[PDB]
Amino acid sequence: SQQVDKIKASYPLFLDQDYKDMLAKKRDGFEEKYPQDKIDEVFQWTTTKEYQELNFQREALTVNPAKACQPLGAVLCALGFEKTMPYVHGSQGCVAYFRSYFNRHFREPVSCVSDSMTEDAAVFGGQQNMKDGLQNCKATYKPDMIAVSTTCMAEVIGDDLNAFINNSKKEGFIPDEFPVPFAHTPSFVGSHVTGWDNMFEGIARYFTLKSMDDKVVGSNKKINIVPGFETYLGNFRVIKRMLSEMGVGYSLLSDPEEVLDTPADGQFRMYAGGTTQEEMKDAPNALNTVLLQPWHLEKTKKFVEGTWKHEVPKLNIPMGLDWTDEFLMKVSEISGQPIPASLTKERGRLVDMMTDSHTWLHGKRFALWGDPDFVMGLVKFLLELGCEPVHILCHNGNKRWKKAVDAILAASPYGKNATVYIGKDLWHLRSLVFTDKPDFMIGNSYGKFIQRDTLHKGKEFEVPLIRIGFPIFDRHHLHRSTTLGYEGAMQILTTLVNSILERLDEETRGMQATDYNHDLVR
Amino acid sequence: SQQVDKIKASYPLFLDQDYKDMLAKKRDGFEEKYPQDKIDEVFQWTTTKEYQELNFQREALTVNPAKACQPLGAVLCALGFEKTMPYVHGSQGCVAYFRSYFNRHFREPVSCVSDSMTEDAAVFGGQQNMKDGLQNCKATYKPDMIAVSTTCMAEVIGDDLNAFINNSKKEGFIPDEFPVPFAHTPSFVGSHVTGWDNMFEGIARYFTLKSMDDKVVGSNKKINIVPGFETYLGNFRVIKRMLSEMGVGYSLLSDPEEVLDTPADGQFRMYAGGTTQEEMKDAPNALNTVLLQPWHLEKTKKFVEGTWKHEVPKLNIPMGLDWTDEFLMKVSEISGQPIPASLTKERGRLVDMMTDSHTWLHGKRFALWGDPDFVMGLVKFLLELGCEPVHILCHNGNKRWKKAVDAILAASPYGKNATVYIGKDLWHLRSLVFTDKPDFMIGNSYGKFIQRDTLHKGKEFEVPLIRIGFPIFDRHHLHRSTTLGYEGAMQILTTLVNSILERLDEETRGMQATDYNHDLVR
Amino acid sequence: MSREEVESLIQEVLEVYPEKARKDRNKHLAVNDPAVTQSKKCIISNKKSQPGLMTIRGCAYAGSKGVVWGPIKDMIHISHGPVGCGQYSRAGRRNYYIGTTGVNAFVTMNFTSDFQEKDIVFGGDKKLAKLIDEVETLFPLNKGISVQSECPIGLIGDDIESVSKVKGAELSKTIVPVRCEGFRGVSQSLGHHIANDAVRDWVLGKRDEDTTFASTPYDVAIIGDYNIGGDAWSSRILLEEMGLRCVAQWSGDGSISEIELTPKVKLNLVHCYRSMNYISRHMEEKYGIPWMEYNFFGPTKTIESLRAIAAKFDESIQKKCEEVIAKYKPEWEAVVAKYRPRLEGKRVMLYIGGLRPRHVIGAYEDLGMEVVGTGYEFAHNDDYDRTMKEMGDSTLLYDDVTGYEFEEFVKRIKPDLIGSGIKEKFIFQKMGIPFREMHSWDYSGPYHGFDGFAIFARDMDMTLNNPCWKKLQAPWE
Amino acid sequence: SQPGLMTIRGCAYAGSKGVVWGPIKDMIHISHGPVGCGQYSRAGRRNYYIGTTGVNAFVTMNFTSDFQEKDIVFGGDKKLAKLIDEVETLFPLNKGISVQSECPIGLIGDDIESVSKVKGAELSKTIVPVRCEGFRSQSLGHHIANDAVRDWVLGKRDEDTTFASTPYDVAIIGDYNIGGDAWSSRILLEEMGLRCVAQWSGDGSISEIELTPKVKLNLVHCYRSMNYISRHMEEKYGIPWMEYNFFGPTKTIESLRAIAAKFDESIQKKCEEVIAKYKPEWEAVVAKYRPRLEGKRVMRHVIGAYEDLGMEVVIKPDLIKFIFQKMGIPFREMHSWDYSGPYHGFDGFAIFARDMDMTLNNPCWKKLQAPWE
């Protein structure tokens, strides 16, 4: 039943008595459900340390992973270039999924095409698919460049992307001068960030490898900036803004900020902004190249150091106070531009916010997860805040990254209770937050289920989720946020301290029970 | 008792069994407390419509007001001028309270002095207090200007500010040329915003009244901006940023954003930035003056129109889509500067966010309160979002402002269930949110108590608070936010839609009860 | 527009294509003639997507794991292969269920073998057996396991059938190998067929020799309702109010036991013909169970379907059907009275997967709205046979529409509202056209039944008449 | 105070309403005058209490007469009477009313004593007029509030002998229960075998004030603010009083032994038992935090716990709000305990040590200088 003036959606409509009785009848009659006491016993068991040991003994099963596959990162990288169509050679279902994933995170159109390889291509290869698809894409969506990656089907059958594209050009399917950079992006290797790395290296190779004769390092008085896999628009914007305030000439390579934030003014813009082909061609003339997320830009680093001959600085991701300081000082040294008074004042204001909020931040225990560079930047900032990271999970991390993070933790008295987990998923993390309960989680939307689980053990065991990372599907416009620089540190600090304060307010909202501590002033 | 490894603060320390027994013994033995059943009955009664009628019949009693007194606004206005010490002629306790209030909202040092009028000044005047205080303030804090307001005691005894300052100059306590603008700021008239208006008019009169002969309107090719009582630093910043993006010459009069946001770099800065005296002197040469918050800048408007001879535009506060559009268009008309593509794109991005979040915003019911201009801007934006304001409360509003807000409500179908209340306090609002429950409140920190009350009736009756306004004491660094312009509209929209989504997640977190609607994607 | 105008528009849209793509796409665009009963002579469907044209279609894994198997709540569905497919499809489809997630229900969880390079080179069958053992250890209350093959499984020669057989025999567990590799077929449709065949081969016949289930003459099974936003529940309450006993639900809020009990029912009520007609036909051949298509979208279709269903049973069911119709008449009449004046005459074009492009037309017409265009991602010719009579004359039908095609069609037709998926929503929101997600119900719903109709009318009004659509033009432009 | 010098001192109203009267939970305190004073002081002090706010307790609410121009010109006595009527109508469970005069009340010739007398006799309710006009530090406000307590509440049960007294009856006077401090003290005294009959004003009730003359010993915490009432009670009821200091283990143990020495041997034995019970807890707190705080320097009742943590009280101090924060000197609030606490008692000592360590050793203080400066 529905009251026309107070229509109910699924919640709370299915809490109506008739629906409740119907669901009870369905369960009792036909579901053959396990008894509720058995379900409670098994759940309690899943919260135990013994279950945690069994869970961490997993070798073949992965449950609730915290990573995606390479072509997703390849598509994100390709979207950062001017009038560029991401083109995944392989099966179309992958492209449907990539597009929907990015649509839900960014709440924006995401342009990507597939050559729709099918059973016939599984034996004969997808060369005809490549020829037809390149021609159709160029004719229909008129990009200035088509950036090609692969689905796992094409990788397994061993489709030669270079040969396929060269044959497409030779047979006249696309013009010879039309730029078609490519990158093999096997989904069974690494993760989405690896696909971003491979795609960027492929594009940079396409535009620079055969024209290095006339390049002179430092000719253009600029610094190349490679952002890596980045899903906060504010991060691109803050890097560009900070470099502008320093008066530092820069080239942001793979800049998708415009195309992921087009205005709603009655017109659909398939393309907007992005790194121009001329910028990529002139990139070897830069003073140096700075990789914002070095731990997934290894192949790009090797190409840039070995071909462009740039002396890429050893810089951590510019997250938090110390690492933003190091980034800015390295930029000052490379460019010769002093750090201006505006950035010094912004740093001082971040320090002021830290001083104002340290009493609520100090000693707070966090589990967290995400990509390696993001995770280590978050850990470093939490250590700078006096917070205690307890469970540090990076599903797509490696042993060298783990060693670096352990060194960072050992550099601080606030990291003595921390453990770093690589190759572990969010079911492992669920066990961790049950057996060694933190105050909060920091992660993507998939953490909400963990919170749900913890609440089912009881309100006292609930671990609230703070949504920082990718993907965030159950909140709106968080992709506009910033995590890098002093501005990003300010935003993260505000989110953390206010999450703590909202939790405290919730715990002290009980009248005559806990509201003695429901302070007006915090 | 305490565990040294897990130390408990007041919450949850006093939930320990021994403390619970102690408190029960204290209550039962010596407090002579009413029976809990009687307390429950009375609470239920306070949630009823009959209690609401009795509550709204109040004529003499005010409970939990939603306003402050004039000298607070005078102090805030004075802080917006370069090297200016706010000076409140009257009793010292007032200044202690003003400083504490602003310290707690901004989490920054707040400079303000009193001349410490006591019983001796109650019978005689405060003239000796004025002379000694002006001399001491100038000698101790070396301000470039002293802006004098009054506490209620000085107003009641009738101290002549102008005569007192003239005497201080005549007997040499302070130099004759030293600027000492003044304004009577009676706490028993209007509210804090009235004090802001009176102080700004006093300063402007001091710097422009006797030098109007050589002033030519429009000769400096600038637009004056009067922000009014403003406690979001982002609002000053966004106004300056938007005017600069337009290439519009402007003069922000009473700009306190620097002094309220000094960096933490090891030194205390009593003064920072602010409107210079030369800017105030040259203000009559502007093309026009734009009052961002006209509904509490009436005296300032009268002076600016009658003395500077500026044709002050009839503009609403630049809040939300339509009113930001109107502000920008009027600025373009006055200055001759076209609206640049950057602001057009920002507007389009705000519209994009509105289209992205309209399904969750539509029909949501809000109670809200604050100062008149802020409240009407919030109501206009909520109407633009498809939300229904139901309880609009402005304790320091007037009948003309209420008529204007009712006209705004009548122009939208989403204003049909809306009522505007002026001169009503937060106890009235508590009754309203009990008898005509909205989905959310939008207000300052005091609203938290109302939320507590609603939760005591039951979780289904709880009205979550969304903290927008002044003062915000129980969250950190929200004073850095923006509520004006497209940027402020985006921040407000994000806050509202994500508050809705967090509430929905909380309501659907119940395992096997309501978590069928605990969607990953929203 | 006239038929000639729509034909001309189709021709101009196709001009940008290369010759092969143009010739192919010409056969998938049509002007509706409601008198046509054989849609093959007007349009072609269920064909290979043209490469590089930005199709909206998913893969067979989406049709099998995402659509059919995934919603089965007390089973654990292993996305066998690399991590991507399982990750992108995790909790993306709002197939609602009641359970304790991670204990006895597993719908929103992503179970995967997370294939690495060594798994590709040397195979993952040993890894699959080890994974099954670990699943049994860590989720002891699961009532079955399905193994949904991703693309590499069928390319590296893996034999998931043998692993499933051996581990199921050893563990006394139903382990269903599904060969739904993404490269198979041309869309999610073959995924539906493969999933239906897997259900038939590994689950459906479990209780063939079992006669302990007490059967009644009013035993029905809801087939092909995946409980999007509780849709199936909103349907079920009506059928039980009519006096019927809904033994099974396929597969929204579905359990393996009700699937096994389905061969015992008296009637199969098929909502989504496209995804479950295979298993319905098999059940008719094997168990003699009649099946009938029905439609619970909007009051007119709901009343017609309730009466058609009650006609299959005795007089008591018919009387209870009339009582249900009378009970709900004031509610949906109030909904119409409130919302039709705000929606009368409004034009909508749809593009959805396999059933909803034709099934939701009646609800829009109940709100006075007109569907001027419709099309399918992966429908077959029988679906187009069904929808040609439903659509108005000279309306635009599109099969496997490309992004360019749909954008141009919308620009010319200028509908008041568009109902499609997440990959088109923001495109059409940029152009200022109101958009409603007709896959996920825009995280609203249910839309089935009378309560669903109330929600549907509210949502259509809130999106179509939202203030935001009057603000996309800056006043200075 | 010297005029024009930016002092932090409050007014008499802050001393009376903010410090003394406001924490009394079951009374309603009318900030009589313009709106400012009650608003700035609303819930600004963390004088903790247990109750149902708006029903039987009112500490965090702001009741005011909200004086307008007409109230200034024509007086506000009639408005005060009408306001009291409305208070009775809308808050029937209140156990009394106080009227805290703001600055204009004394300057406009308002006579709140007569209104209080008439309305209190009419409604059979205690209505306490307080002439705490802000122009009259908060020390004078404390004195005026104490005189009001003496004149209107304290002697209300002088002729009442129905309360059953015990030789172990004590009253905790002048503990404002900041962050629960008084509670943390009370649990010790009741563990000692004493009966805490009265505790005010922190978590204080009007009945506890009325019962205070029935106790055997007055234990004063804030001696400066309630010594007037304490000496009056000594003179009139013959009740001895003494200061107690529960800040830090050393002061707590000394104060407990001094209090127990005023009673018989059973109380002394129970005091030794309490001390032995809590010795391991504060010893563990010291073991954990004294190494993290040894040798640090801080700029009369606070030296105890600081010394118990190995700290020096006094230049370059390591510890001494926002002005000192800008200089980069770690600062702690001595008034609200930085929204932490309690700091009194053994549990309060644990909290105090944790807070001192977290503020003194926070990395934020090490980041004042930019690495390029």
Ligand code: ICS
């Ligand atoms: S199963 Fe099919 S695409 Fe029949 S694959 Fe698809 S939950 Fe669509 S038009 Mo998403 S044939 Fe269901 C469908 Fe229809 S996922 Fe849902 S909305 S009624």
Ligand code: ICS
């Ligand atoms: S103890 Fe009291 S509020 Fe007497 S609780 Fe308070 S350090 Fe005040 S007016 Mo903060 S009764 Fe001391 C006081 Fe006065 S904390 Fe200090 S300044 S002289």
Ligand code: CLF
């Ligand atoms: S068509 Fe379908 S979704 Fe595509 S792979 Fe194939 S079953 Fe799967 Fe999978 S991990 Fe990523 S998303 Fe692919 S490239 Fe492989």
Ligand code: CLF
């Ligand atoms: S010293 Fe003390 S706090 Fe000052 S007024 Fe006097 S009692 Fe009060 Fe009140 S309303 Fe505002 S804050 Fe004053 S100017 Fe009057």
Ligand SMILES: [Fe+3]
């Ligand atoms: Fe968007």
Ligand SMILES: [Fe+3]
């Ligand atoms: Fe600060």
